[PDB]
Amino acid sequence: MHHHHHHSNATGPQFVSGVIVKIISTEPLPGRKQVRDTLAAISEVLYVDLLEGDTECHARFKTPEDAQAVINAYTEINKKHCWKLEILSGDHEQRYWQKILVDRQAKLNQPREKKRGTEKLITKA
C-alpha cells in the first residue's frame, strides 16, 4: 500500500461526492419535478435529491464544473423566482454524503416479492 503523500494536509476516502448542490428557496419551489427540470435545463445533472414536502433540495452532479456553472447561471433564476444555490464543500459536503451512504445501507430492504417464508432476514444467510 504505497503511501499517497507525506504530511501535507490531505483527505481520507475518495468517495465521488457527486458534487452536492444545495438548493433553497422561499416558496416558488415548485417541486422535485420542476426543480429537477430547472437545474437540469441549465446543465444536465445526474440525480436530484429534493426533501419531499420540504423547501430544501440537494441535487448531485457527476462533475464539479457542472455545479459551478449551474450555480453561476442560477443568478438569473431570480429573474423569475428568488432561488438560492450553494455547493457543499469540506466536512459539509462529506457530512451530507455520509447521510446518503447510510441511506444506501438501509435501502437493503427492497419492495416486490423476494425469498420465501416468514418476515425475517439476516444479511441473506
CA R_g for the chain: 19
3-state secondary structure of 74: helix
- Cα–Cα distance between 122 and 86 in angstroms, integer? 40
Q: What separation in angstroms does the CA of 42 have from each of 55, 71, 75?
A: 20, 10, 12
- Cα–Cα distance between 23 and 2 in angstroms, integer? 40
- Cα–Cα distance between 23 and 26 in angstroms, integer? 11
Count CA atoms closer than 13 A to 76's CA, side-chain side. Answer: 7
